[PDB]
Amino acid sequence: KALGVALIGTGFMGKCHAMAWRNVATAFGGLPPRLEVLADMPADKAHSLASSFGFARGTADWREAVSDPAVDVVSITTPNGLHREMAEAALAAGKHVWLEKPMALSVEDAQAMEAAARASDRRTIIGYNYTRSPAFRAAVDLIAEGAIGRPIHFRGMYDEDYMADPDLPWSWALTRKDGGLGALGDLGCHLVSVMVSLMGPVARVYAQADTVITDRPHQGGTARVENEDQAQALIRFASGTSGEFSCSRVARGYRCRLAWEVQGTEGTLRFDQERMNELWLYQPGRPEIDGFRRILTGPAQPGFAAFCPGGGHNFGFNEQKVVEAEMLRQAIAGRGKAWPDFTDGLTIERVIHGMATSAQTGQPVNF
Amino acid sequence: KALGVALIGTGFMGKCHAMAWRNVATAFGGLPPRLEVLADMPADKAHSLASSFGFARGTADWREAVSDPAVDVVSITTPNGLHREMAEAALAAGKHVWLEKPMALSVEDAQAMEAAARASDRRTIIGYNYTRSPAFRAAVDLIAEGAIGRPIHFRGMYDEDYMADPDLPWSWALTRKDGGLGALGDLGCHLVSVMVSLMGPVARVYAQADTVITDRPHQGGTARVENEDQAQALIRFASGTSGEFSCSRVARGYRCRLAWEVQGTEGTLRFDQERMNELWLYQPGRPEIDGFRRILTGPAQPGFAAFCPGGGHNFGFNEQKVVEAEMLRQAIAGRGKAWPDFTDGLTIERVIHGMATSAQTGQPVNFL
Amino acid sequence: KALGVALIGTGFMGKCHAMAWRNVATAFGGLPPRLEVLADMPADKAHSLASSFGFARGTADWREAVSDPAVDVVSITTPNGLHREMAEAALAAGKHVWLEKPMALSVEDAQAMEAAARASDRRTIIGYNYTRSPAFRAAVDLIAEGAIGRPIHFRGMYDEDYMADPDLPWSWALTRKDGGLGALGDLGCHLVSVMVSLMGPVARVYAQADTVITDRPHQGGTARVENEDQAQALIRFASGTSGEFSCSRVARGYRCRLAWEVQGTEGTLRFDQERMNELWLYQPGRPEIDGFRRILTGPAQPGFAAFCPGGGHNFGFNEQKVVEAEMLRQAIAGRGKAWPDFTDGLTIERVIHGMATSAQTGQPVNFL
Amino acid sequence: ALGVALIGTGFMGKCHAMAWRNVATAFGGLPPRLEVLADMPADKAHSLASSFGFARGTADWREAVSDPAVDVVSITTPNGLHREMAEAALAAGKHVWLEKPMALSVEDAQAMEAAARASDRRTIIGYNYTRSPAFRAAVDLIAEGAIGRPIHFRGMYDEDYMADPDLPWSWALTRKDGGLGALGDLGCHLVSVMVSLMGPVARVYAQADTVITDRPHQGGTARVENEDQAQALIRFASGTSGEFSCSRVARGYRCRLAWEVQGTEGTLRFDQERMNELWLYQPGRPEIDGFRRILTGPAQPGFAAFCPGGGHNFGFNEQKVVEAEMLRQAIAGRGKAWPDFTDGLTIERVIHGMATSAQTGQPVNF
Numbered sequence A: 001k002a003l004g005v006a007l008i009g010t011g012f013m014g015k016c017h018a019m020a021w022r023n024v025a026t027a028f029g030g031l032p033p034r035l036e037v038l039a040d041m042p043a044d045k046a047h048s049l050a051s052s053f054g055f056a057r058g059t060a061d062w063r064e065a066v067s068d069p070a071v072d073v074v075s076i077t078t079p080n081g082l083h084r085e086m087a088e089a090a091l092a093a094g095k096h097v098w099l100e101k102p103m104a105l106s107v108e109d110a111q112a113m114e115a116a117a118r119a120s121d122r123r124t125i126i127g128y129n130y131t132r133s134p135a136f137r138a139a140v141d142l143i144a145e146g147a148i149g150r151p152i153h154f155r156g157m158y159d160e161d162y163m164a165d166p167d168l169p170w171s172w173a174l175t176r177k178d179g180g181l182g183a184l185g186d187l188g189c190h191l192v193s194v195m196v197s198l199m200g201p202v203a204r205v206y207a208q209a210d211t212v213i214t215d216r217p218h219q220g221g222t223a224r225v226e227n228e229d230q231a232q233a234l235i236r237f238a239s240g241t242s243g244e245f246s247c248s249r250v251a252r253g254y255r256c257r258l259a260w261e262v263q264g265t266e267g268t269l270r271f272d273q274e275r276m277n278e279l280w281l282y283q284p285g286r287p288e289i290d291g292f293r294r295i296l297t298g299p300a301q302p303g304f305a306a307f308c309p310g311g312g313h314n315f316g317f318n319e320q321k322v323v324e325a326e327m328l329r330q331a332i333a334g335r336g337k338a339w340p341d342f343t344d345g346l347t348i349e350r351v352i353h354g355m356a357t358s359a360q361t362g363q364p365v366n367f
Numbered sequence B, C: 001k002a003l004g005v006a007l008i009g010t011g012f013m014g015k016c017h018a019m020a021w022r023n024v025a026t027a028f029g030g031l032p033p034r035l036e037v038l039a040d041m042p043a044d045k046a047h048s049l050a051s052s053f054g055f056a057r058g059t060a061d062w063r064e065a066v067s068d069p070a071v072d073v074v075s076i077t078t079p080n081g082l083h084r085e086m087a088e089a090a091l092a093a094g095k096h097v098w099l100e101k102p103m104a105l106s107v108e109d110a111q112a113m114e115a116a117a118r119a120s121d122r123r124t125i126i127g128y129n130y131t132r133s134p135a136f137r138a139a140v141d142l143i144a145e146g147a148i149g150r151p152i153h154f155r156g157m158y159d160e161d162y163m164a165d166p167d168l169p170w171s172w173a174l175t176r177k178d179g180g181l182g183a184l185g186d187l188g189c190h191l192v193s194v195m196v197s198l199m200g201p202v203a204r205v206y207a208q209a210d211t212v213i214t215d216r217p218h219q220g221g222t223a224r225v226e227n228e229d230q231a232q233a234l235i236r237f238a239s240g241t242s243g244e245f246s247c248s249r250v251a252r253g254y255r256c257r258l259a260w261e262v263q264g265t266e267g268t269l270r271f272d273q274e275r276m277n278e279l280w281l282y283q284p285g286r287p288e289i290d291g292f293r294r295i296l297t298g299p300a301q302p303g304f305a306a307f308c309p310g311g312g313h314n315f316g317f318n319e320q321k322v323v324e325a326e327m328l329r330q331a332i333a334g335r336g337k338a339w340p341d342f343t344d345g346l347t348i349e350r351v352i353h354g355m356a357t358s359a360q361t362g363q364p365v366n367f368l
Numbered sequence D: 001a002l003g004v005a006l007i008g009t010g011f012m013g014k015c016h017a018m019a020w021r022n023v024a025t026a027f028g029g030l031p032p033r034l035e036v037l038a039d040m041p042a043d044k045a046h047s048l049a050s051s052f053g054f055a056r057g058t059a060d061w062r063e064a065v066s067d068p069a070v071d072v073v074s075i076t077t078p079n080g081l082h083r084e085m086a087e088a089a090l091a092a093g094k095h096v097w098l099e100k101p102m103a104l105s106v107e108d109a110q111a112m113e114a115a116a117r118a119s120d121r122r123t124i125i126g127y128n129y130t131r132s133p134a135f136r137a138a139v140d141l142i143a144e145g146a147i148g149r150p151i152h153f154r155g156m157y158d159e160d161y162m163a164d165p166d167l168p169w170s171w172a173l174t175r176k177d178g179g180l181g182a183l184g185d186l187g188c189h190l191v192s193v194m195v196s197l198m199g200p201v202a203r204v205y206a207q208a209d210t211v212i213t214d215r216p217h218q219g220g221t222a223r224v225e226n227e228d229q230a231q232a233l234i235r236f237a238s239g240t241s242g243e244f245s246c247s248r249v250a251r252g253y254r255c256r257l258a259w260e261v262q263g264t265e266g267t268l269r270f271d272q273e274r275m276n277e278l279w280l281y282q283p284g285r286p287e288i289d290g291f292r293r294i295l296t297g298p299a300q301p302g303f304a305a306f307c308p309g310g311g312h313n314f315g316f317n318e319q320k321v322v323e324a325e326m327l328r329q330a331i332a333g334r335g336k337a338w339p340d341f342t343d344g345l346t347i348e349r350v351i352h353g354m355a356t357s358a359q360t361g362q363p364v365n366f
């Protein structure tokens, strides 16, 4: 009755998934998932990390992980370029899929995966972990309850500086063919996942983009950076409401600055992921005490009580992934819907690729 | 040789200008300006406020005030619809002009005022006071010294909520003919004054705008709000750099949130007017101590030492206006160039009206 | 009819007082005080600053300024060792007195000044300007209204780093005989003025102190620093409530960090002078929205509306002094009581000297 | 692999269980074997052993600490049970991870400290605020001379879990069954951080108050006997000054363990409610002079074991994974665990000395 887990990849997100699967029942109860197969290359690395992560075995063969009869669900955290192949193989093998963002490098690959998921009758979720913080889920509930009235404006950014150093070498990830989008693919899609959760679907974008560092060192020479370092867009939501949107991988001093704000007719909500335990809420008050409230994360907020009964004991980035694992567990058990599945994920892919198209063509793109 | 001052209006900016003229020599030295004539309506209020503001006389006739031979410079702090008439009369009478923003209701009006100012050979400055804080002036100098390398992105906002209450009555300020622009005219022009001082001139805008409260109480019933409560724009600068721009008069909880950020190849500068004594600077550092610095306003920043020798003694909004007065004083004496004059101001008017045009047409607007 | 003003000193506080006297009627109405006599040394400095500050004349003789028949009130902004002589002379000459903190070098000095003020029947106020911010005055009113219930704890600090550099030269301010207390005299008295305004009178202190830099450069040689660089104290108020208290002139990175909080049975108030426009208020709320409010200074808070009708337009350090001037004008006109007068100031002197005594002897000190 | 017994399943019980489950995931080596979980009643012990992934649940903690498959015992039970359970675990030849404070009295802590030395087993006490990357980074910066010589410490630990007068009385508010109040709940945490930054305490002078003196009990009222808040002036063995406070009645504060070290060449400042930020001032040229916001990332001790990217906030619970790893390494003879029962007993003497100073109105020397 325990869920059988396969994990492909052991990097930033691979180890994050491994830590989540290990403690999901500790936090939320029920049966601890069985950690069956860890796939990674080379073989000696898969064997070492399988042992320390507590997987029953490691293998250099990713298809072993998706085909084992003892596996019910596959975490896929490999580079963007093999997401489509591995996800479709896992669905064809009758496995549920936890796929790291983005879905694939192109809308066309994401469309094929979306059709494959519908055909499989298996649960899918995409790894948009910034939608899982108690603060973010609390903000969505406050908007649903009318805490800020009708939303009238969204302003969101996602700034990091991991590519700011012009000496960082060229890679496949910086080509259109093998890397897909740049900052829009790495960061933009995260901001879309948060933005559409707050404001509903996107109807129109008008975008601009820049490549700040256009060429990088490559094996004693240099190679051209083909995707964007930063992008900005004006949004019209299906509601008719306005939005401002940006992302950057060259914004010096920022490490995880996914920051957003919803302005409403009766209040304002504001958040910055670099301080993920604070949610700022303004509602009209009598003039003597009027001002924004600092809501510090605690057991009043979704998910937090599963990890800690004491408010102000800071919730961590990695615990977002434990919440994500639990949402997929509950969906597989038919006790909840996981968001976003491959259908809702395809919509997010269309928005970021539409922003890329808009920036290139100088035309607004409608959805 | 002391400057003779006429002040028209005694409200938010009228009292701000009066306080600035009274302490400009206290802060910066030289001779205190002579406070000659205060013009306001009705007469009884002009007489009352001339006495408490320390002007030699009050009048209900602004035309007599700008024509007084004892007057050298005119502060104009009246409503937007009166700027063109009063500025043109002041320049025609051979007076230097300190004009509140925005210049007028239309680009056509601003163009006529710009021509009148050049024809007069008198100094002009527009009341873009957010360019006068020690933090802002320190940021411009840091960019000039290459402290953040080459600017690659600007993001700016100016949020206030003074029109957020839907019960606030309709006024002539909310008509296009008598009010001109909405949030772009009240707040947007301030953000442009700061943005172009940091990033240089605007080449292109693509904008969106909304009226979120479309009808307000008027007499027994309601009247239509014709101008925007909020606007946002993507910017392309003449330098080729990108920008994000917004303003709002309905952003709940914000009172004076003119906030901006310049991202460069070698650092980032960030500022919020609601904490006008803090400038955030990131420059790459060794990993053990890497992070943004909180630069607290003190005497190392332009203008501050004229007000206080001790750092961290917070500089105030009103003291921006004393700095503005000193810059006009020095321009009149021929010891400095005042920014923005009516020529520089006209460019700012074209940008905010260009953003309004872009929002109306759904098309980008180019300036160069 | 207008108040005649003498100003002694033109430094940090001298120029602050001059700017306050120049705009007090601009802000609060009535007749602008007449700036009659400025005293400073040397004479040509007094003449130059009298001209730029708008005083009718300058003199190198402080006794000339306090004795002038056109003078009704004297601002005394000279070094601490001169306060007693100048305040007693001004009171003897029948002048009201605006005296900078601390009162003098000793409790004995303050007792003599307190007696002289009662005998003179003139108004006195001491320049505890941190009690004048809209945020501070709002906090006092909130406590009185029961906004935080029953106060149960005070914690206050006043950190600055103006003496943190060991190569900063020795001065006569660093002897006990000529300079009095160290950080307790420069900063401690400010924190006491705020603390007793929130919590009421002090009943008992137990204090510790240190001199961190005991020797400083003196004319190519070295000389001994005799007074404390930092001090900390536990407080019992007359109410029986507990307090924590500290001050430091060597706390690196702090410029004006007068910060306090009052914890109560139904809320908490917290403040930091380096962000003097923010007051933090916690009151119990429904769990979904529970948290501290950031109250941004605006016209709802005492004094602010006299300077600006727009909330979030930051009130400045110097404008605290315009409020202080207005409180003295109103006390002179018999329309308000100024705090603290020399009687209430003597109590503050007893508290800071009791803390110094406690730190010296390792024993608690009790008051009235 | 290490065999683990866990006693208790509450706030710290679940925290320890999550730590033992991911310590090898984060730091490598063999995952500890989760052998026995002890809790009452037996149905709760069985259901939580199942969800926590322990091989068996028992309502008898004594046979859990005696199990031959157990090498180390996590003790997360109420304060009054610490002495009995730690002494039994040491006597059975087990390593001990004990929650703070050690016990209700110095007498009890003295007995536990002797038992730990008499055994050749490792001990560590759950002072988990010493485990954050920001805190460990601050200790390293001080040792490296980044702020020169410490000249002042100011620390507080404010929470409001007892601030509401409506909150009912409990046995924890008696001296006999509860021991100390705010000093025992929060004060000992602040001491663990303070002595790690400044070195040992030489002297305290303290004040304490019970500000809500009676609470609802069985439709009547019962007396609160221990302190709601306490403050102390400190002298360290170094001669340096300190300020210290704790409170369980400080409205609006949830986990406000906040401290500051002022030095001859800079200042370090930290607030646990923003546990991923360390504020460092060092003198700079006037145009750029100011405090640096150091955001937690892989440059700080422990962080890289959890995440390769800076600014991905480290959490309260991950402090406990670091604590587990330090105990693992100490059991393997590859590091000393701090604080053991000897170093823990010093902390107990400091908080009990503060309580005595407040009661007698006299300084207490150590």
Ligand SMILES: NC(=O)c1ccc[n+]([C@@H]2O[C@H](COP(=O)([O-])OP(=O)(O)OC[C@H]3O[C@@H](n4cnc5c(N)ncnc54)[C@H](O)[C@@H]3O)[C@@H](O)[C@H]2O)c1
Pocket: A008, A009, A010, A011, A012, A013, A014, A039, A040, A041, A042, A060, A062, A077, A078, A079, A080, A082, A100, A101, A102, A127, A128, A129, A186
């Ligand atoms: N949700 C988030 O917060 C977040 C953050 C970063 C990464 N991601 C996504 O996670 C994915 C991984 O990124 P990362 O930073 O973890 O990268 P990484 O390079 O650290 O991880 C790649 C892992 O996949 C393994 N791998 C590569 N090719 C393989 C193959 N053919 N078969 C088996 N294993 C293979 C590698 O050995 C490594 O363990 C990407 O799709 C990325 O976009 C999302």
Ligand SMILES: NC(=O)c1ccc[n+]([C@@H]2O[C@H](COP(=O)([O-])OP(=O)(O)OC[C@H]3O[C@@H](n4cnc5c(N)ncnc54)[C@H](O)[C@@H]3O)[C@@H](O)[C@H]2O)c1
Pocket: B008, B009, B010, B011, B012, B013, B014, B039, B040, B041, B062, B077, B078, B079, B080, B082, B100, B101, B102, B127, B128, B129, B186
């Ligand atoms: N720079 C800034 O930060 C700032 C802030 C506020 C206003 N402003 C600008 O300054 C101007 C003043 O706005 P405000 O908020 O002070 O408005 P206000 O209503 O407070 O000021 C209007 C003043 O002008 C006087 N006045 C009106 N008509 C007059 C006439 N015909 N003759 C003489 N006096 C007349 C009024 O009696 C009043 O004293 C506007 O153009 C506004 O956009 C700028």
Ligand SMILES: NC(=O)c1ccc[n+]([C@@H]2O[C@H](COP(=O)([O-])OP(=O)(O)OC[C@H]3O[C@@H](n4cnc5c(N)ncnc54)[C@H](O)[C@@H]3O)[C@@H](O)[C@H]2O)c1
Pocket: C008, C009, C010, C011, C012, C013, C014, C039, C040, C041, C060, C062, C077, C078, C079, C080, C082, C100, C101, C102, C127, C128, C129, C186
């Ligand atoms: N309230 C506050 O916030 C604050 C801040 C700073 C200083 N102060 C107080 O103000 C006083 C002045 O300190 P400061 O920082 O302005 O110092 P300063 O050195 O800047 O000012 C001293 C002034 O007094 C003048 N002076 C000195 N001896 C004189 C004499 N015999 N006759 C006439 N003029 C004489 C000097 O020429 C100078 O103008 C002190 O008592 C200090 O404690 C208070």
Ligand SMILES: NC(=O)c1ccc[n+]([C@@H]2O[C@H](COP(=O)([O-])OP(=O)(O)OC[C@H]3O[C@@H](n4cnc5c(N)ncnc54)[C@H](O)[C@@H]3O)[C@@H](O)[C@H]2O)c1
Pocket: D007, D008, D009, D010, D011, D012, D013, D038, D039, D040, D041, D061, D076, D077, D078, D079, D081, D099, D100, D101, D126, D127, D128, D185
């Ligand atoms: N280090 C920290 O940050 C931190 C935080 C909270 C608590 N603590 C400490 O940890 C301890 C746990 O406190 P808590 O808040 O988790 O309390 P709690 O009530 O949540 O935990 C008590 C647990 O012990 C179990 N238990 C009680 N008596 C038992 C017995 N005789 N046999 C077996 N199991 C028994 C209970 O069933 C429960 O699971 C206390 O000593 C407290 O001081 C430390």
Ligand SMILES: O[C@H]1[C@H](O)[C@@H](O)[C@H](O)[C@@H](O)[C@H]1O
Pocket: B310, C160, C162, C186, C187, C190, C255, C256
């Ligand atoms: O800001 C402080 C404070 O205002 C004191 O009154 C003064 O004595 C100090 O020198 C100054 O730095």
